[PDB]
Amino acid sequence: MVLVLDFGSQYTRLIARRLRELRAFSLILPGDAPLEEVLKHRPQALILSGGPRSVFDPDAPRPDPRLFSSGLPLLGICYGMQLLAQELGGRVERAGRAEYGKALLTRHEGPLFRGLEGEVQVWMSHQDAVTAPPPGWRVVAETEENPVAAIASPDGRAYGVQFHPEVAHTPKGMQILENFLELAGVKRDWTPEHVLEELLREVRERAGKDRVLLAVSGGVDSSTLALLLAKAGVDHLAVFVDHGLLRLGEREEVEGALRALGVNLLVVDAKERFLKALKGVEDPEEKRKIIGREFVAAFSQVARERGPFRFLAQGTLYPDVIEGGLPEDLEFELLEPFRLLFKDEVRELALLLGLPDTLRLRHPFPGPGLAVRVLGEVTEERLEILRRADDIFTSLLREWGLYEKVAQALAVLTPVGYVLALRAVTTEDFMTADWARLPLEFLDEAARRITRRVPEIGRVVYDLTSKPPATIEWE
Amino acid sequence: MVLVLDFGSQYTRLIARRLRELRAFSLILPGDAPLEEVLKHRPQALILSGGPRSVFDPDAPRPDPRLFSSGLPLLGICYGMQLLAQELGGRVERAGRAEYGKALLTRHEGPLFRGLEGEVQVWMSHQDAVTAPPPGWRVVAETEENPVAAIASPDGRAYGVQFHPEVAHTPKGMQILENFLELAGVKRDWTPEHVLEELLREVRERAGKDRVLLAVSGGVDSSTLALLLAKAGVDHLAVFVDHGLLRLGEREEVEGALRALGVNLLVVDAKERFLKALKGVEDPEEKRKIIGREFVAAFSQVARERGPFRFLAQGTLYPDVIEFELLEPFRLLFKDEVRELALLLGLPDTLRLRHPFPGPGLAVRVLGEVTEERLEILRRADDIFTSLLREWGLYEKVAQALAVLTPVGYVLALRAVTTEDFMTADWARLPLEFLDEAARRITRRVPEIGRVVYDLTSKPPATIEWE
Numbered sequence A: 001m002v003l004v005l006d007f008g009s010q011y012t013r014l015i016a017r018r019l020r021e022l023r024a025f026s027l028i029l030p031g032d033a034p035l036e037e038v039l040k041h042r043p044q045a046l047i048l049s050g051g052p053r054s055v056f057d058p059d060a061p062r063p064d065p066r067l068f069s070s071g072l073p074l075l076g077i078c079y080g081m082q083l084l085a086q087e088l089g090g091r092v093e094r095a096g097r098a099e100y101g102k103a104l105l106t107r108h109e110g111p112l113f114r115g116l117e118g119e120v121q122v123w124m125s126h127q128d129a130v131t132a133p134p135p136g137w138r139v140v141a142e143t144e145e146n147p148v149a150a151i152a153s154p155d156g157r158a159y160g161v162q163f164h165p166e167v168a169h170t171p172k173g174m175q176i177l178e179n180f181l182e183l184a185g186v187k188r189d190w191t192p193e194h195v196l197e198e199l200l201r202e203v204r205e206r207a208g209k210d211r212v213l214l215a216v217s218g219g220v221d222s223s224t225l226a227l228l229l230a231k232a233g234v235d236h237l238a239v240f241v242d243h244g245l246l247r248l249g250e251r252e253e254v255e256g257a258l259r260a261l262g263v264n265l266l267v268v269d270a271k272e273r274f275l276k277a278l279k280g281v282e283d284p285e286e287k288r289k290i291i292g293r294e295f296v297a298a299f300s301q302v303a304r305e306r307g308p309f310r311f312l313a314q315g316t317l318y319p320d321v322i323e324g325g326l327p328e329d330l331e332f333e334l335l336e337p338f339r340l341l342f343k344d345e346v347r348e349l350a351l352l353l354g355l356p357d358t359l360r361l362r363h364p365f366p367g368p369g370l371a372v373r374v375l376g377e378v379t380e381e382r383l384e385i386l387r388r389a390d391d392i393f394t395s396l397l398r399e400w401g402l403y404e405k406v407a408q409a410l411a412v413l414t415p416v417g418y419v420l421a422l423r424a425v426t427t428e429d430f431m432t433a434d435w436a437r438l439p440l441e442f443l444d445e446a447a448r449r450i451t452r453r454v455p456e457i458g459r460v461v462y463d464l465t466s467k468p469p470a471t472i473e474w475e
Numbered sequence B: 001m002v003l004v005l006d007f008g009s010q011y012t013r014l015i016a017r018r019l020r021e022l023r024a025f026s027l028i029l030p031g032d033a034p035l036e037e038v039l040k041h042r043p044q045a046l047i048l049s050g051g052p053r054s055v056f057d058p059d060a061p062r063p064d065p066r067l068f069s070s071g072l073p074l075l076g077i078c079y080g081m082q083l084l085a086q087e088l089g090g091r092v093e094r095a096g097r098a099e100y101g102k103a104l105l106t107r108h109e110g111p112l113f114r115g116l117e118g119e120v121q122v123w124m125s126h127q128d129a130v131t132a133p134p135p136g137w138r139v140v141a142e143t144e145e146n147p148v149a150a151i152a153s154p155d156g157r158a159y160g161v162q163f164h165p166e167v168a169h170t171p172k173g174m175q176i177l178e179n180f181l182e183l184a185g186v187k188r189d190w191t192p193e194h195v196l197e198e199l200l201r202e203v204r205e206r207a208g209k210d211r212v213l214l215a216v217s218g219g220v221d222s223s224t225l226a227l228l229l230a231k232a233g234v235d236h237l238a239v240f241v242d243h244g245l246l247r248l249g250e251r252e253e254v255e256g257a258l259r260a261l262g263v264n265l266l267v268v269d270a271k272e273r274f275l276k277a278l279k280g281v282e283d284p285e286e287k288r289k290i291i292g293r294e295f296v297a298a299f300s301q302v303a304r305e306r307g308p309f310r311f312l313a314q315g316t317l318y319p320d321v322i323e324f325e326l327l328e329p330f331r332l333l334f335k336d337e338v339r340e341l342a343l344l345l346g347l348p349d350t351l352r353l354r355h356p357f358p359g360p361g362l363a364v365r366v367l368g369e370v371t372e373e374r375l376e377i378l379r380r381a382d383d384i385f386t387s388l389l390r391e392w393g394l395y396e397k398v399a400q401a402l403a404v405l406t407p408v409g410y411v412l413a414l415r416a417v418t419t420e421d422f423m424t425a426d427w428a429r430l431p432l433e434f435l436d437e438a439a440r441r442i443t444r445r446v447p448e449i450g451r452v453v454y455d456l457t458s459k460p461p462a463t464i465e466w467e
């Protein structure tokens, strides 16, 4: 268990994910947290993230002084390296500006850097500088502008880096993090079989003879949660609400696979209800309000009729922890087996649970579905048009091997006569995303087939906007 | 002057243009024209185009038999090669279906294939087929499935080809047409100075000392016309009607260059008129109608307030051909040829190499009703797109670029195409890195634009403009 002490860096979650990609469990904890707190979990190592403020800024978070006196192997990143320096007898001074930049390490030596030969580009932090490492420590790295890009204690237990190894701009950062783990002798217990073993155990003990209620959307999160309950053999009822806003053929694909795998599934046909409720509504916020409201209604009705249900399982993920509404009279005990996992780790568990690639590798799709993909009132005719265009887009992407090369793809119908907007992005965290640069020949093919097979569509465009400044969905 | 006999081919205008590119004047005439009409222009050579209907089709166009016994060098293309066959003893039979196809000539010999070595890809017509050439002719070309790709007369003055040498899909087609002109001994009098001289003379005589009124829009066409009049010492009143729907700084660039060149220019401020007249209107149709009505009103008023004007000069072009006396000195030219004259008339590249811009201007580029605010948003986005295109050296690599403002809050659609004739058009495959730069610069510098989009639609099925 490696502890990530968060000092505000926008890459903190990233640090935690990289550790797991190196088969080490990672947990995040605010930087300024009592020593008893950071230790109560038995950290095998510690990592001090960076932060947007200078170590000179009084508002900037400070760790527990005792922290540096625990004997725990530790790595300091940017702000973290500077904290480590001044807090131990080294000298840090103001310099540069709070910004990043690519830089080549003109010197990189010692165990922290093995495997890294040739050019070693790093994503340097330009805010301040340690000009003197703690007395007795070694400067194991430099760039042209900074004679001290990394430091290490004489016993090889603590290290500091003036750059971000968890970021893509430091292509060899993973190896550096891997060297650190190897150095701190961190056990690599974070494997999928280990996770599965634990979750089944837990879910069985907790659920007991009782029955679990769960909502299923088609997404891989809830699907894997369903498979978990079934495989664990706990009594449960998975509820799939067909709001009639799903992609072409989605309901059948989902119901067929989950049932074949053994989940007690109940499909609710609420298409008419949702469409009715959505009549004349353009405001995307209102659409979501209405969708959320119709959904909690049909779901509660099911819970009551098929009840009682002692537990309500949810697919809460670690990102949710680190930051609809059921009727008050409906009381449930929460079962959240994935609360310490990242989305991709659940996709891995799905593999061990027997979920087929058809569903295990599909892209995320929103709760309000196609309703947020028609700019304007949602009508049955508009959905029929968007469903068709969307289907053709997804199929071409799969045909040309491009589907697995984007994090998400979608089509948006814009009434004029219709203009269809194709949209695909690349992202890890869905919180910053770049427009996907699909081949021009592919875009031409997608546009010709759409206007060809869906004559109501008179023009096709491709969204060139990243996030920031724009959202992934158009509304 | 080479004559093109039109038998219906969608590539007929292309044939005419290629010849000009080969410095030979060219004119088009219906394929079923009287021999007398065909010969009054004293053509040095004739070219029979292709056509959609079979030579067996009774309603299909027929030439004047005598035309084949006129002693003039001729080239029959597809449907044209068929006529050439049957009308002279050869045999032509039904085959395949009216469609085209790329094919390699398995053999190509003769002065018609002079210089076309290596492989020769042609765009073959699959509608019927010459199975036997006229007696005495030589099948100087073949393909895999078709033994008679091209035929040549024994006198080496007539030729037929089962492919379209005028289309890009026949890469070396221009060389074949060049070889035929050489054979035909065609003189190359189609040069810019000859055109300018001829045009200065005419304009001068036709107008004499009367008053000729012409409208300048900003387009290289109107501008060149204005410069032609001035250069010819003709008395004119160039009228530039600023409807307030132009591109950033367009008016200042046009009046400054035209005045500096000697054009008697009068710019009319009608910004308000057009703006007020367009309030609340969204129908693309109405906009154009409204804009047109307002322009005439504005133009008519100056025609009177400063009349009388015997002549009304217009920049009518050949493709067009294909209380006022009209003076159209360009009706036999293509736009590109007018750009060439504009060079000789000393027009600066800044206005001489600009992409076309519609009369309704930005009014047809606002998906919805036009307003001053929306216009300002669009004008700044449009400006940025143009500038980036010029900076990257892409502006000259596309036939037209434009931006459409879609009120949603605004989504902006970038749109560029490549075209020969604006009557077909492909969406321009701009570099991905470039579109990224364009999208970021726009949302950054024009905050009201929250999303930038790129149009992937060709013509057909869609129009170049969004309305």
Ligand SMILES: O=c1[nH]c(=O)c2[nH+]cn([C@@H]3O[C@H](COP(=O)(O)O)[C@@H](O)[C@H]3O)c2[nH]1
Pocket (backbone or CB within 6 Å): A288, A364, A365, A366, A367, A368, A408, A430, A467, A470, A471, A472, A473, A474, A475
């Ligand atoms: O379950 C959902 N209900 C919603 O209302 C919703 N809105 C956006 N999304 C998804 O979240 C990610 C980010 O989309 P945005 O950049 O537009 O916020 C993308 O993956 C979106 O598909 C939703 N998911």
Ligand SMILES: O=c1[nH]c(=O)c2[nH+]cn([C@@H]3O[C@H](COP(=O)(O)O)[C@@H](O)[C@H]3O)c2[nH]1
Pocket (backbone or CB within 6 Å): B288, B356, B357, B358, B359, B360, B400, B422, B459, B462, B463, B464, B465, B466, B467
């Ligand atoms: O003078 C003009 N007045 C107009 O109303 C107009 N509408 C379209 N265009 C131009 O004509 C070409 C083809 O545009 P479309 O494929 O949308 O018809 C393109 O070059 C268009 O810019 C216009 N020019």
